[PDB]
Amino acid sequence: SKAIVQCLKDAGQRSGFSMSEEFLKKCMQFYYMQKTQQALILVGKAGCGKTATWKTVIDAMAIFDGHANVVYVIDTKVLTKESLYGSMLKATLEWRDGLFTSILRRVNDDITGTFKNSRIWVVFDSDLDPEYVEAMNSVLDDNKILTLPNGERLPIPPNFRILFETDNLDHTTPATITRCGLLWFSTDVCSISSKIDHLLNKSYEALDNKLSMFELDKLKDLISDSFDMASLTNIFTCSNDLVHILGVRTFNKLETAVQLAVHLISSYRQWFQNLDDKSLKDVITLLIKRSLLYALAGDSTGESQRAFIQTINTYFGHDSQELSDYSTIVIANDKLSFSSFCSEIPSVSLEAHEVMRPDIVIPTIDTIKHEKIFYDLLNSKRGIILCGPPGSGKTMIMNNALRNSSLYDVVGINFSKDTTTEHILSALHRHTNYVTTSKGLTLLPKSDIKNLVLFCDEINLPKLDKYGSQNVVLFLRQLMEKQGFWKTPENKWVTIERIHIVGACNPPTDPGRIPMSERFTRHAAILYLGYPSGKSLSQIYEIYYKAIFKLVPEFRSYTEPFARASVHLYNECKARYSTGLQSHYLFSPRELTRLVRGVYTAINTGPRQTLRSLIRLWAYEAWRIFADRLVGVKEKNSFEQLLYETVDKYLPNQDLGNISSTSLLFSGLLSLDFKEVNKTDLVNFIEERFKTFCDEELEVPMVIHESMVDHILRIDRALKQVQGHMMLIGASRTGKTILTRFVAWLNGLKIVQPKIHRHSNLSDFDMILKKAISDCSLKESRTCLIIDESNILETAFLERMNTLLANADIPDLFQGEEYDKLLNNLRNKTRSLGLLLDTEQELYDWFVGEIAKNLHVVFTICDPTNNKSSAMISSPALFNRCIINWMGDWDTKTMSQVANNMVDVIPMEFTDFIVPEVNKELVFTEPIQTIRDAVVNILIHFDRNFYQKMKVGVNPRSPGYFIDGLRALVKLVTAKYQDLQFSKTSQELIGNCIISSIYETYFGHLNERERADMLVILKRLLGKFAVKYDVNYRFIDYLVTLDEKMKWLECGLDKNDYFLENMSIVMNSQDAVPFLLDPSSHMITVISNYYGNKTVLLSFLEEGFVKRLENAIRFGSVVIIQDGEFFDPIISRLISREFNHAGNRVTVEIGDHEVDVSGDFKLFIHSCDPSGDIPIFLRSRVRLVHFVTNKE
Ligand SMILES: Nc1ncnc2c1ncn2[C@@H]1O[C@H](COP(=O)(O)OP(=O)(O)OP(=O)(O)O)[C@@H](O)[C@H]1O
Ligand SMILES: N#Cc1c(C2(c3ccc(Cl)cc3)CC2)nn2c(O)c(Oc3cccc(Br)c3)cnc12
Ligand SMILES: N#Cc1c(C2(c3ccc(Cl)cc3)CC2)nn2c(O)c(Oc3cccc(Br)c3)cnc12
Ligand SMILES: [Mg+2]
């Protein structure tokens, strides 16, 4: 025993470990246990000392036995099973060995090298699960054999031993536990003081060799004694009650303290040589206090730090130099006259246009000290985590700190829900290079001489597996702790050279955030950033307003009240519109930065202003920033009241009028320069242009309305910004996708709409995006890429769109040989434009900038509560770029205007009784007038009643039925009038056509009893107004002639009146596709018996469908399509009637097939069961009809 105890002590002394009794006990335990078992399990907290334990035991054995030690360390859960074990390829049988088997192969077959004279230690340092240990269960059994799907058995020699280093056994089985030796590290192995001594000596190993001995000794004892005092321990005990973010235990922060202290002290070595002891001690103390401060309290929220400073100044001796939060040391005049000063703030003289330089920042004390500590921590070669609320200048501080530097270049990697290690490596590929060396296997240096910083933003979102392992965080742990990784297709080790890791995060309490592993976070210097105190925001924005008001110099004095109004508005918005109403009510200071850039642009491209104009403009900007996202009229009304209050407080001027969102239409369309133009003139301009647009493109009947023109102006404001991405939330059947096309047409943008269907995959969405990006860059084509939620049928599409809007590229699209090709194309393009760039970076910057100004992505979303929609809204890459617009739903006034416009064209015979009714009711639902208003009110009231009865609770209630029934009522009324071309019959035609149009539009999916209740609640509305009717009306007898009545039964229709009404609805619809939901198969026969041999039958599951359907429309055939609880989005142009007009022809894009419609075509859809979901696109265009037998 005694010899092993001695060898252990020697190993620990060489490593600089303190041979604590607990450390000794655990080392001896591990030494004895490994003698009779091969599968060891070591469990404990992060930082227990387990890795130190087993490495020290290995070295002790290396001394005592004289045998060699080969070690392999595998962070196993970064890898997949296929990458660890082997697999089979697509068809080739060739077996890819996988890492663990490849090393076992080398351990056995080699017969060259001292593996027989070596112990082989394969360490699986990660959290373990059943699947992985199960895939190797035969290695733990007495077979001691690795069995492979390849049918071969690999015998393991006695030399091969396995260590499961981990932190938890929650998901491990007793079956494995009972075959292993379990070692539970029930405590930390060493003292805080001894860990400090070890860390000191470790850094001395680096710095001592460079430094000359005379300085070296005096310095290292000058630090050791002061740093080792008891009071510091007192301080640690006074740490444990402080409110740390992320919660790393005090034992795991010493690394940060020692490295930052030693780095700082060593930075002044060239000066220190002249000082007296007193001044030197002072400087040493002050640096150690500053490093202790930020090591222990840097994760605390400001006040804690200023309060903790008092404790540090109290528990150190009062003679020692006092520490203040602002204190910084500056080398004044000659060497050694250091000055401890604060607020050396440079005054920035921003020119007006520099308001929209994204690299700019205001020199504020907070930012100065953050940039300071950031760069010190980076220079110490420690990892960092910049945690802070959304919009706490986490990135701005980094960008400023590193932009000035010429040494530390940046890569940005914006995480999402499912980022992969492949995404990280694909990011790295553009900047990095791989070199082969025998000594370092594959070294990965960066592609130059500098240092490289990986800014991994949103690091706490990647979705963990069911065991809780989020593998990318383990990969980043591997990169820090091990300085490398395994390349698993090659199975060789990669050492990283000079690359640094920086994290950024939103606090773990926010929605959707995952608590990261302590094993990971222990390696990083965590810092907290907070919102800049409000007042400092008033100073920052006072600078911005003064800069932009250099364009209007007489108004320079008002920059203070403008800034104060801006922050006052911000603060009250953030307070009153919280996330408890809607999850998208988030407000950062970036809302104000958008504000000042918008106000700038508006002034820059505007005419001469007066103060009245300035206030109007500022109100417009405030509206389009803050309030466009709001839903609820009470919220908009309170926003108006808030605006009035803010302006009354700060800008008390005399000629402000209504500030309503619809009373301040600033435009840049009619006039060359941006100014508040008149609504009438806008109306007439939009009418003529939209008519011309419809004539030039397709035939869509749309009636101009004031909401439409407002939303037009909002989309124009979006599309004219340099990098404006819009998102249009709201219902279906409300013009989104045609308004965006219209405004794109006005702006001369190209339009793109992805053509994805039931089989399109990632590869296809990749070809779409590569096409778009190549047009935007090489052709400069300025494309409006329109996306709908239906297009992202898997989350991979959403991750790519996140990468796009987060950056201005997809690295994965241009990797490898495609990168070399791309580089060649850009060289040719640039030289064709006469600007010449040589090195890859310059051209890629040009590339990315051209994308960033020539690509506008617009997301329509029909129902926000859908899980896909919720993911798109919740995506941070989308949310922090997309101007959110809430179109929502149509109001009563808009419905009345649209209805009145449609009703006015139709002739209306005078009816004597329509006037005396007016006096009576006074419900106040439209100005009292004539039949036109009476009809409008009846339609609006019925639509409201119907959406009460259907049980549709919140917002999925598009105006589709309203528009369709209104259009069908013109066809009825004017047809019946032609039939009439009596004195008791003419006037009830109105009521009967009202009823008829309603049955056509609303009744098709109602049960008989629901139809009865509708009929009652309608009938009362007619008798509620002047609309008399046939009291004995019957829909069947009114609409269906006796010949048709028989003809259907001859075709085999069931003699049930409910079926007769349904058949009337489906045959009487013109330009609307019936959707026949009949599980009882029979309809697909009655239709065929009616139309005869010329009835084609098709299916979404017959994979020849698309070509045969094109053929069918070429023939003018009737078509029925089976299996409706399936849809193929390529057919949408048949369903949503649209056809690009031609002179001679009338054409439709059925995919890329620009097919001419043979007129006589008729589409029916059928479906076999009501449990099949109907996509909302179909469900709001298509006439849904149910033949299902009903018990009622
Ligand atoms: N006897 C000792 N004397 C001095 N320092 C020690 C001693 N034991 C452990 N340490 C210090 O504690 C540190 C953390 O322990 P170790 O590196 O083994 O982490 P770990 O327990 O393996 O945690 P993880 O689960 O994160 O891998 C060591 O780097 C070392 O600096
Ligand atoms: N322009 C700007 C901008 C500003 C303002 C600013 C504040 C202080 C100073 Cl001295 C200068 C400017 C203009 C108000 N703050 N600000 C941030 O906080 C950011 O923080 C992030 C970064 C990445 C992800 C997430 Br989530 C949040 C990003 N940009 C900004
Ligand atoms: N005709 C027509 C048309 C209509 C209606 C209409 C509305 C306003 C007016 Cl003035 C006239 C008619 C007929 C009810 N809505 N509508 C859209 O919503 C469109 O964009 C989409 C498409 C799919 C999903 C989503 Br979400 C948006 C494109 N065209 C139309
Ligand atoms: Mg370890």
Structural domain contains residue 105: yes
Q: State the distance from the centre of ligand 4 to the C-alpha of 483, rounded, in angstroms.
A: 14
Q: Give just the sign of the alpha carbon dihedral 1091, 1096, 1097, 1098.
A: negative
Final residue belonging to a domain, choices 164, 185, 206: 185
- Quote the number of domains for the chain: 6
Report how far residue 811's alpha carbon sits from residue 420's, in angstroms, rounded to the nearest whole number: 13
* Spacing of C-alpha 570 from chain mean position: 24
Structural domain contains residue 660: no
Can you tell me which residue has the tokens 């030399």? 159
Q: Which atom of ligand 3 is nearest to the CA of 703?
A: 10
Q: Are residues 150 and 43 in the same domain?
A: yes
Give the contacts of 242 (CB within 8 A, at least 6 positions apart).
Answer: 297, 300, 304, 308
Q: Lay out the sheet containing 408-414: strands in order across.
A: 408-414, 451-457, 499-505, 383-387, 524-528
Q: Are residues 720 and 709 in the same domain?
A: yes
Report how far residue 101's alpha carbon sits from residue 146's, in angstroms, rounded to the nearest whole number: 8
CB contact at 8 A, 727 and 878: yes
Amino acid at 323: L
CB contact at 8 A, 1086 and 1097: no
Structure tokens, 883: 């101007």
Q: State the distance from the centre of ligand 1 to the C-alpha of 120, rounded, in angstroms.
A: 22
Final residue belonging to a domain, choices 115, 150, 185: 185
Report how far residue 690's alpha carbon sits from residue 702's, in angstroms, rounded to the nearest whole number: 9
Residue 166 parent element (H or E) = strand 160-166
Q: How far apart are the first and last CA of the chain?
A: 91
Q: Is 381 close to ligand 2, i.e. is its CB under 6 Å away?
A: no
DSSP, residue by residue, 733-798 = SSSHHHHHHHHHHHHT-EEE-----TT--HHHHHHHHHHHHHHHHHS---EEEEEEGGG--SHHHH
> Residue 102's domain is classified under what CATH number?
3.40.50.300
Can you tell me which residue has the tokens 């070591």? 42
Q: State the distance from the centre of ligand 1 to the C-alpha of 188, rounded, in angstroms.
A: 9
Structural domain contains residue 582: no
Q: Is 862 close to ligand 3, i.e. is its CB under 6 Å away?
A: yes
Give, using CA atoms, the residue closest to atom 5 of ligand 3: 733
Give, using CA atoms, the residue closest to atom 11 of ligand 3: 702
DSSP, residue by residue, 186-224 = -S-SS-HHHHHHHHHHHHHHHHHHHS-HHHHHHHHHHHH
Structural domain contains residue 915: yes
Q: Is 18 close to ligand 1, i.e. is its CB under 6 Å away?
A: yes
Give, using CA atoms, the residue closest to atom 4 of ligand 1: 17
Report how far residue 976's alpha carbon sits from residue 974's, in angstroms, rounded to the nearest whole number: 6
Ligand nearest to C-alpha 731: 3
Q: Are residues 1083 and 1028 in the same domain?
A: no
| Burial class of residue 224 in the structure, from the number of CB atoms within 10 Å of its CB (0-12 exposed, 13-18 middle, 19+ buried) | middle
Closest C-alpha to 991, from 980, 1004, 976, 978 = 976
> Partners of 395 in the beta sheet?
none
Q: Are residues 267 and 246 in the same domain?
A: yes
To test ligand 2's pocket by mutation, which of 397, 567, 590 has the most ligand atoms within 8 angstroms of CB? 590
Closest C-alpha to 1123, from 1102, 1142, 1143 = 1102
> Residue 334's domain is classified under what CATH number?
1.10.472.130
Q: Is 886 close to ligand 1, i.e. is its CB under 6 Å away?
A: no
> Partners of 96 in the beta sheet?
87
Report how far residue 934's alpha carbon sits from residue 707's, in angstroms, rounded to the nearest whole number: 23
Give, using CA atoms, the residue closest to atom 15 of ligand 1: 49
**How many other C-beta atoms lie within 10 A of the C-beta of residue 410?**
17
Give, using CA atoms, the residue closest to atom 12 of ligand 1: 49
Report how far residue 1073's alpha carbon sits from residue 1081's, in angstroms, rounded to the nearest whole number: 19
CB contact at 8 A, 56 and 15: yes
Q: Are residues 898 and 877 in the same domain?
A: no
**3-state SS assignment for residue 1084:** helix
**How many other C-beta atoms lie within 10 A of the C-beta of residue 1175?**
15
Q: Are residues 460 and 499 in the same domain?
A: yes
Q: Which atom of ligand 1 is nearest to the CA of 167?
A: 25
Instruction: Decide the pairing of beta strands 1074-1077 and 153-155.
Output: unpaired
Q: Are residues 26 and 161 in the same domain?
A: yes
Q: Is 361 close to ligand 2, i.e. is its CB under 6 Å away?
A: yes
Structure tokens, 156: 């393991």
* Spacing of C-alpha 463 from chain mean position: 13
Q: State the distance from the centre of ligand 2 to the C-alpha of 551, rounded, in angstroms.
A: 25
User: 1117-1150: string of b/e by CB count within 10 Å (b at 16+)?
Assistant: bbbbbbbbeebbbbbbbbbbeebeeeeeeebbbb
DSSP, residue by residue, 327-372 = -EEEE-SSTT-EEEE----PPP---GGGGG-TT-----HHHHHHHH
Q: Output the CA angle 1101-1104-1107, nearest 5 degrees.
A: 130
Q: Are residues 829 and 903 in the same domain?
A: no
> Partners of 728 in the beta sheet?
860, 885
Report how far residue 897's alpha carbon sits from residue 903's, in angstroms, rounded to the nearest whole number: 10
Q: Is 1001 close to ligand 3, i.e. is its CB under 6 Å away?
A: no
Closest C-alpha to 935, from 980, 999, 985, 993 = 993
Report how far residue 396's alpha carbon sits from residue 360's, in angstroms, rounded to the nearest whole number: 9
Q: State the distance from the centre of ligand 2 to the C-alpha of 397, rounded, in angstroms.
A: 8
Q: State the distance from the centre of ligand 1 to the C-alpha of 52, rounded, in angstroms.
A: 5
The domain in which residue 492 lies consists of 365-528
Can you tell me which residue has the tokens 């006092």? 322
**3-state SS assignment for residue 1120:** strand
Report how far residue 677's alpha carbon sits from residue 1078's, in angstroms, rounded to the nearest whole number: 55
Ligand nearest to C-alpha 27: 1
Give the single-character DSSP code of 321: P
Structure tokens, 660: 């309503």
Q: Is 733 close to ligand 3, i.e. is its CB under 6 Å away?
A: yes
CB contact at 8 A, 884 and 708: no
CA-based R_g, the chain, Å: 37
Structural domain contains residue 1078: yes
Residue 477 parent element (H or E) = helix 471-482
Structure tokens, 950: 């259907």
Give, using CA atoms, the residue closest to atom 22 of ligand 3: 737
CB contact at 8 A, 711 and 862: no
CB contact at 8 A, 325 and 306: yes
Give the single-character DSSP code of 1051: T
Q: Which atom of ligand 1 is nearest to the CA of 23?
A: 1
The CA distances from residue 453 to 61, 392, 429, in Å, are: 40, 20, 14
Cα dihedral value 974, 979, 983, 987, nearest 10: -30
> Residue 955's domain is classified under what CATH number?
1.20.920.20
Give, using CA atoms, the residue closest to atom 29 of ligand 3: 735
Q: Are residues 176 and 213 in the same domain?
A: no
To test ligand 2's pocket by mutation, which of 354, 396, 455, 458 has the most ligand atoms within 8 angstroms of CB? 396
Q: State the distance from the centre of ligand 4 to the C-alpha of 49, rounded, in angstroms.
A: 7
Ligand nearest to C-alpha 596: 2
Closest C-alpha to 105, from 153, 144, 39 = 153
CB contact at 8 A, 500 and 378: yes
Closest C-alpha to 743, from 800, 773, 701, 786 = 786
Helices (H), 1035-1172: 1035-1039, 1042-1050, 1057-1068, 1083-1091, 1105-1115, 1132-1135
Give the resolution value in Å: 3.5
Q: Is 1117 close to ligand 2, i.e. is its CB under 6 Å away?
A: no
Closest C-alpha to 756, from 725, 783, 787 = 787
Report how far residue 956's alpha carbon sits from residue 860's, in angstroms, rounded to the nearest whole number: 15
Q: Is 47 close to ligand 1, i.e. is its CB under 6 Å away?
A: yes
- For the chain, helix (H) and strand (E) counts, in that order, are 46, 33
Closest C-alpha to 222, from 214, 232, 230 = 214
Structural domain contains residue 312: yes
Structural domain contains residue 562: no
CB contact at 8 A, 1011 and 1003: yes
**Binding-site entries for ATP:** 44-51, 388-395, 730-737
**How many other C-beta atoms lie within 10 A of the C-beta of residue 1060?**
19
Final residue belonging to a domain, choices 847, 868, 888: 888
Give the contacts of 384 (CB within 8 A, at least 6 positions apart).
Answer: 374, 377, 378, 501, 502, 503, 524, 525, 526, 527
**3-state SS assignment for residue 398:** helix
**3-state SS assignment for residue 812:** helix
Structure tokens, 702: 């749309």
Report how far residue 1043's alpha carbon sits from residue 1065's, in angstroms, rounded to the nearest whole number: 16
169 phi-psi bin (left φ>0, alpha ψ -120 to 50, beta other): alpha
CB contact at 8 A, 751 and 715: no
Report how far residue 806's alpha carbon sits from residue 138's, in angstroms, rounded to the nearest whole number: 47
Structural domain contains residue 441: yes
Report how far residue 470's alpha carbon sits from residue 421's, in angstroms, rounded to the nearest whole number: 11
Report how far residue 232's alpha carbon sits from residue 221's, in angstroms, rounded to the nearest whole number: 17
Q: In three state form, how does the secondary structure of 70-137 look?
A: EEEECCHHHCCHHHHCCECCCCCCCCECCHHHHHHHHHHHCCCCCCCCEEEEEECCCCCCHHHHHCCH
CB contact at 8 A, 1150 and 1113: yes
Closest C-alpha to 929, from 905, 891, 963, 900 = 900
Q: Are residues 961 and 910 in the same domain?
A: yes
Closest C-alpha to 1114, from 1148, 1144, 1165 = 1148
Can you tell me which residue has the tokens 């655990």? 26
Q: State the distance from the centre of ligand 4 to the C-alpha of 185, rounded, in angstroms.
A: 12
Give, using CA atoms, the residue closest to atom 25 of ligand 3: 732
CB contact at 8 A, 730 and 864: no
Report how far residue 615's alpha carbon sits from residue 627's, in angstroms, rounded to the nearest whole number: 17
The number of residues making up the chain comes to 1192
Q: Is 147 close to ligand 3, i.e. is its CB under 6 Å away?
A: no
Q: Are residues 983 and 857 in the same domain?
A: no
Q: Is 395 close to ligand 2, i.e. is its CB under 6 Å away?
A: yes
**3-state SS assignment for residue 416:** coil
| Burial class of residue 861 in the structure, from the number of CB atoms within 10 Å of its CB (0-12 exposed, 13-18 middle, 19+ buried) | buried
CB contact at 8 A, 19 and 189: no
Q: Are residues 298 and 217 in the same domain?
A: yes
Structure tokens, 121: 């230690």
Q: Give just the sign of the alpha carbon dihedral 1061, 1066, 1067, 1070.
A: positive
